[PDB]
Amino acid sequence: MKLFFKIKPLLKVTRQEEEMQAKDEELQRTKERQQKAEAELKELEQKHT
Amino acid sequence: MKLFFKIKPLLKVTRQEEEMQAKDEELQRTKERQQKAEAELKELEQKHT
């Protein structure tokens, strides 16, 4: 029982995300990445010009 | 370190997102867009060089 105890925390979240939530989080991350990429691209284009 | 950098984002993120049916679709679209952006950026960088 002590074991379960120290261990009980490392557990989750992944399941919950899948049920939801996980997809939403992933989407958000992707969006952020895309935005960053776009910004970088714009900068690169300017530099190239 | 650059590697970790481009990569640091993909981390968390999914399966749930993909499933979401609407969410999943959105995620897929976002991913595609991101990929395209990345390709464009790479091309731009090469041109700049």
Cα-based torsion angle of the residue sequence B36, A26, A38, B26 in order, rounded to the nearest 10 degrees: 60
B41 neighbourhood in chain A, CB within 8 Å = 37, 40-41, 44
Task: Kindly state the tokens that stand for B36.
Answer: 């395209």
Do B14 and A30 contact (CB within 8 A), yes or no? Answer: no
CB proximity B16 to A under 8 Å: yes
Obtained via which technique?
A: electron diffraction
CB proximity B14 to A under 8 Å: yes
Do A35 and B26 contact (CB within 8 A), yes or no? Answer: no
